[PDB]
Amino acid sequence: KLLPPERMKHSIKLVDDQMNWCDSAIEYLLDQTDVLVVGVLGLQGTGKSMVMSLLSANTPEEDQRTYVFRAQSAEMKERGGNQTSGIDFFITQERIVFLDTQPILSPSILDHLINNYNLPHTYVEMQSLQIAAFLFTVCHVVIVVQDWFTDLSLYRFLQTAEMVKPSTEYYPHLVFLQNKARREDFCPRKLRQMHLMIDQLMAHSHLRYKGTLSMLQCNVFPGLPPDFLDSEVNLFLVPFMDPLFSLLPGYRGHPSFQSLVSKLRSQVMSMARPQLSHTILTEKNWFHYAARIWDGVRKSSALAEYSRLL
Amino acid sequence: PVSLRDLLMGEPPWREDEICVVGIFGKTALRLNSEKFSLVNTVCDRQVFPLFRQDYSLLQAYYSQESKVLYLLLTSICDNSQLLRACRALQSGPHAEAHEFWKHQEKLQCLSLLYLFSVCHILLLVHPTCSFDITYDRVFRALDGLRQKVLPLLKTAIKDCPVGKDWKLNCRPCPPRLLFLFQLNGALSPKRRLQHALEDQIYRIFRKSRVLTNQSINCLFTVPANQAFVYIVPGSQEEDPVGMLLDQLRSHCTFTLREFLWQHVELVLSKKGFDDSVGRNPQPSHFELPTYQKWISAASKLYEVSKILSSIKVLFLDIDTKFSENRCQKALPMAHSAYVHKNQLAQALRVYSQHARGPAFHKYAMQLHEDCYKFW
Ligand SMILES: Nc1ncnc2c1ncn2[C@@H]1O[C@H](COP(=O)(O)OP(=O)(O)OP(=O)(O)O)[C@@H](O)[C@H]1O
Ligand SMILES: [Mg+2]
């Protein structure tokens, strides 16, 4: 007579599309402690929803129609639109919270706003910060997804996000995920370049972006020693999804999608779980804390101070 | 294929030929084949830019006689071949100097962009993905307001040149036309639907932001109204040449871009021009088809350019520096309104570091420290 509470089959919502708190998740939270939270940040079609699903309760053999975090549809790409609005919520059997978000600085959102306080552009540029800060405050790990390398605008947006957060200070970890990578990106010569650029671009960020999640020690580069790199930041690469001599396949130059996804999942479930506030929280007090944090972020001052400057 | 400064200095074979200039800019990715060089090598049909070939900005040019067209290419931090050099140096040879470093580079590329927006007929921006960076809606907005402030300093130079009447007035041959190039990157005929969608988006964005208007004079650039102005480059095996070879090995053992650009170059070579005005009462836009020497005569005088320093030192890291300064200042109150002495010193220092911080905390910190040490 020690059955579990209940199993979830699909994700739910946590913040309405109009930035409004939704209290419909306590039905799945317990009074247990030592929980782990995860968040994401990215643009329109980087692959956020398709990543969290595979990291929490999904496999590559399944179909995009069974993902707990709905992905984009063909009818949505040919029209240049989005599919994720607000913030989602999900919790697995291992008692790990996952949070999906909407793209930052999305053109579709602005376009929609057109047909509906000074300019909507500043409003859309604010929402992104309003969300990034909240995530940097109520999360242990924050993943950043990208389609191509070195956008140069994301590094500025991030730094500007950690300066308007609510408030011996807390700074979460950071992971740099490179989605849709290719052979040219699985070369040591370019690998060191990536690490070098990331280090010189986030030297005064205060965020934990190094000293963890070393793909070098996960068998991705078998015969490569750590001395080849001056400083290995926490970066990961995810590629594109898919008598005897004649059937040999082609040379792709990188490991399969399944292997890398599995390794990333294993390394994410092993991330630290330090305290957020000055107290030990459970799967409920955290919910209340986050609600208060959101209510505060909205009626903040630094954000308004930055909005008036635009 | 030679630098701009190394060209204006030095023609007789083509000293007189009606031409059309084409400016190229945008971002790129860390690859071996830039999305700009391949473009030229693809249009001209010849390998112009071969394979395996203080400031971090640059310009390049190339004139094609078989087509009577001049190409200008821009390169700045936005790219990666340069950003890599910047970081590499910064690694060998403070949270107060680096900020100024990046800010200076941004200003440099901004003026280098204004240059193209003044001596070009057509110009296009490239992007590695379909989705376009909305932040552009701000760059352009912060660019026009600048040219105007410095417009006299320009016309006061080409003044003694054969530019013409309208050219000498607006320091431009005609309101340039902007084109967009997007790389598929594995996404996805439907391409046409995507193109039209992006066009509608860009139009509404630049319209609500007022970057585009009915008058084709006040605006710094314009887009068409009946033709297409968005191209999507699909996949291609050319990239990653090694891969291609391997593919070939496995075998020995077992509209269009040019057509998309000519529809716009013809209107200029034929002297017709561009007429974009739908204000219910359109106005006429000037135009001028110069020659080689007649063009360099002004290009050199503009490239050789004094108040631009003061005009650009006001124009984005500016908001970041402003926020950091305002924060440190507003916090100085609680730092001074709190205070052997080391106890109170460290206490106020911690309260200050926890009350607010930014990119200029060193100054506001040393100030409070000195004040405390002087008040006892
Ligand atoms: N590695 C990959 N290989 C192939 N296709 C991918 C890959 N990653 C993502 N995709 C595809 O690209 C799209 C990714 O968008 P997805 O719905 O996963 O979230 P998102 O676009 O980041 O979120 P949003 O659009 O709401 O901001 C989907 O159509 C998915 O099939
Ligand atoms: Mg999504």
Side-chain angles (χ1 to χ4, degrees), chain A residues 2-5 7-15 17-21 25-26 28-30 32-60 62 64 66-74 76-105 107-115 117-121 123-124 126-155 157-166 169-183 186-204 206-229 231 233-241 243-255 257-277 279-294 296-298 300-310, chain B residues 1 4 7-10 12-14 17 19-31 36-44 46-52 55-65 67-80 82-96 98-99 101-105 107-136 138-159 162 164 167-188 190-199 201-213 217-225 227-236 239 241-246 248-258 260-265 267-274 279 282-284 286-287 289-303 305 319 323 326 331 333 335 338 341 345-346 348-349 352 356 358-360 365:
Chain A
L2 52 80
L3 72 163
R7 195 186 209 83
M8 305 170 59
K9 277 74 70 178
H10 200 255
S11 84
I12 65 168
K13 188 176 286 293
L14 180 66
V15 169
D17 61 340
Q18 61 182 357
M19 290 306 115
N20 258 308
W21 193 256
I26 56 168
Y28 308 98
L29 300 178
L30 282 67
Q32 186 156 302
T33 181
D34 195 53
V35 68
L36 175 73
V37 183
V38 182
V40 182
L41 278 73
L43 299 164
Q44 259 200 0
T46 55
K48 314 186 273 309
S49 313
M50 215 196 73
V51 159
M52 308 310 267
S53 306
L54 273 62
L55 292 179
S56 58
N58 293 107
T59 53
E62 295 181 1
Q64 287 177 348
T66 71
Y67 286 4
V68 304
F69 288 118
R70 219 194 297 189
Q72 274 182 3
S73 44
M76 193 57 95
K77 309 202 235 202
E78 306 164 359
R79 293 184 289 108
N82 65 337
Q83 164 59 238
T84 305
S85 77
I87 307 177
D88 292 2
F89 175 93
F90 188 77
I91 183 151
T92 80
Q93 55 206 14
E94 283 81 19
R95 299 281 109 191
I96 289 156
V97 171
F98 281 88
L99 300 176
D100 203 354
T101 61
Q102 64 183 32
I104 61 190
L105 321 162
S108 305
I109 300 170
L110 194 49
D111 197 293
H112 268 65
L113 274 187
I114 300 296
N115 313 270
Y117 281 115
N118 206 317
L119 271 188
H121 303 241
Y123 180 72
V124 170
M126 268 164 51
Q127 287 183 357
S128 316
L129 302 166
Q130 211 191 329
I131 279 177
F134 157 90
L135 295 184
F136 285 164
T137 304
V138 305
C139 293
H140 296 114
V141 181
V142 186
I143 296 160
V144 182
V145 197
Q146 297 158 274
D147 281 331
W148 53 290
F149 189 60
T150 45
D151 182 277
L152 190 49
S153 297
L154 206 70
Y155 300 108
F157 179 91
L158 295 179
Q159 288 151 8
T160 46
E162 68 178 1
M163 299 161 32
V164 300
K165 64 184 287 183
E169 189 175 1
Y170 185 64
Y171 289 118
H173 293 260
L174 207 70
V175 182
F176 291 105
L177 179 67
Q178 278 294 313
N179 196 18
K180 287 189 233 187
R182 329 205 162 87
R183 183 192 66 82
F186 278 96
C187 279
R189 205 181 170 202
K190 207 176 141 185
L191 189 77
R192 61 174 293 111
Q193 291 177 18
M194 294 183 192
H195 289 101
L196 191 151
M197 301 161 82
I198 306 286
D199 207 332
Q200 301 307 147
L201 281 149
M202 293 292 269
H204 320 101
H206 269 160
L207 302 159
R208 287 149 154 178
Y209 67 93
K210 51 162 64 170
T212 302
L213 195 149
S214 174
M215 66 205 303
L216 195 41
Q217 82 197 29
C218 297
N219 221 36
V220 190
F221 305 91
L224 205 77
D227 294 332
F228 188 74
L229 279 70
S231 70
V233 293
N234 43 16
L235 185 146
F236 192 81
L237 312 179
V238 165
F240 270 101
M241 183 158 30
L244 283 84
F245 165 85
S246 306
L247 295 171
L248 259 175
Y251 174 99
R252 59 182 159 208
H254 59 81
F257 186 72
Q258 278 70 236
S259 313
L260 301 177
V261 175
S262 169
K263 298 187 185 243
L264 176 69
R265 192 192 295 132
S266 83
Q267 293 304 303
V268 164
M269 289 194 287
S270 318
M271 298 303 286
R273 319 181 181 202
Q275 313 310 317
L276 275 52
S277 65
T279 297
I280 299 196
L281 299 170
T282 63
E283 301 175 6
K284 279 189 176 137
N285 304 328
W286 167 95
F287 190 90
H288 292 288
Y289 174 62
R292 189 192 327 148
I293 289 278
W294 181 254
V297 166
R298 274 176 105 186
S300 68
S301 66
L303 285 182
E305 180 172 356
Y306 195 95
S307 171
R308 279 180 207 114
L309 294 175
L310 275 45
Chain B
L4 198 51
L7 186 85
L8 302 181
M9 302 292 175
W14 53 75
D17 283 325
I19 57 176
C20 168
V21 299
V22 180
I24 302 170
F25 66 115
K27 316 185 153 146
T28 65
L30 189 68
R31 295 166 310 212
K36 285 162 187 175
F37 296 180
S38 300
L39 192 155
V40 170
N41 279 332
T42 301
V43 166
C44 311
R46 53 182 67 259
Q47 283 290 113
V48 169
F49 294 95
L51 188 51
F52 307 135
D55 59 28
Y56 287 113
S57 179
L58 184 62
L59 284 157
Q60 301 212 54
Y62 177 77
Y63 176 65
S64 183
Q65 324 181 40
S67 66
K68 309 299 195 316
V69 71
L70 182 157
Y71 290 111
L72 292 195
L73 277 79
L74 176 59
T75 315
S76 74
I77 54 171
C78 277
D79 298 4
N80 310 98
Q82 302 285 98
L83 185 75
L84 172 62
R85 303 176 68 220
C87 297
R88 196 179 260 151
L90 198 62
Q91 179 207 348
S92 194
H95 185 32
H99 195 88
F101 174 108
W102 299 113
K103 185 176 173 67
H104 178 242
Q105 302 286 56
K107 179 176 73 69
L108 183 65
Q109 83 162 3
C110 191
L111 61 84
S112 167
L113 207 64
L114 171 66
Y115 182 56
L116 278 71
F117 270 62
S118 295
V119 302
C120 281
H121 284 131
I122 288 155
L123 70 163
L124 62 164
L125 67 77
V126 299
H127 206 253
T129 45
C130 273
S131 180
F132 66 102
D133 291 330
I134 189 171
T135 188
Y136 272 120
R138 193 204 285 208
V139 174
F140 299 156
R141 222 168 45 205
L143 193 149
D144 54 45
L146 164 61
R147 77 181 279 269
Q148 300 197 335
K149 184 191 162 164
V150 301
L151 189 136
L153 297 166
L154 309 164
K155 51 166 44 166
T156 55
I158 69 190
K159 178 180 51 45
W167 192 324
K168 291 187 164 194
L169 282 164
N170 293 317
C171 193
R172 62 171 64 167
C174 78
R177 187 181 289 281
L178 190 69
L179 277 67
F180 298 90
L181 269 67
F182 294 108
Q183 270 181 359
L184 204 63
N185 200 13
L188 301 178
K191 267 183 72 193
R192 302 186 174 272
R193 301 167 180 68
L194 188 41
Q195 288 185 12
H196 299 313
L198 285 165
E199 290 179 356
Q201 280 188 354
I202 300 160
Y203 195 76
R204 303 188 204 105
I205 303 298
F206 289 151
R207 197 97 188 183
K208 175 52 71 81
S209 64
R210 280 185 192 83
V211 166
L212 259 51
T213 82
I217 310 156
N218 310 305
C219 304
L220 72 164
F221 80 80
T222 189
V223 290
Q227 322 180 252
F229 57 107
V230 164
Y231 193 65
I232 284 169
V233 191
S236 297
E239 296 104 315
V242 163
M244 202 177 59
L245 287 171
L246 291 155
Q248 282 276 64
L249 187 50
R250 198 185 173 192
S251 297
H252 306 122
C253 284
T254 58
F255 290 3
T256 301
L257 194 53
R258 207 202 153 81
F260 168 81
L261 190 53
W262 208 244
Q263 62 179 6
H264 288 285
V265 170
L267 297 201
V268 53
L269 288 177
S270 195
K271 308 184 80 66
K272 307 202 273 297
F274 318 128
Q283 308 323 310
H286 66 92
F287 178 90
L289 170 46
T291 63
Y292 201 110
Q293 77 201 332
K294 182 132 77 179
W295 183 83
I296 77 177
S297 179
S300 299
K301 299 178 82 66
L302 281 166
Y303 180 80
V305 162
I319 304 96
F323 206 91
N326 184 334
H341 75 103
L345 175 138
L349 183 64
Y352 177 72

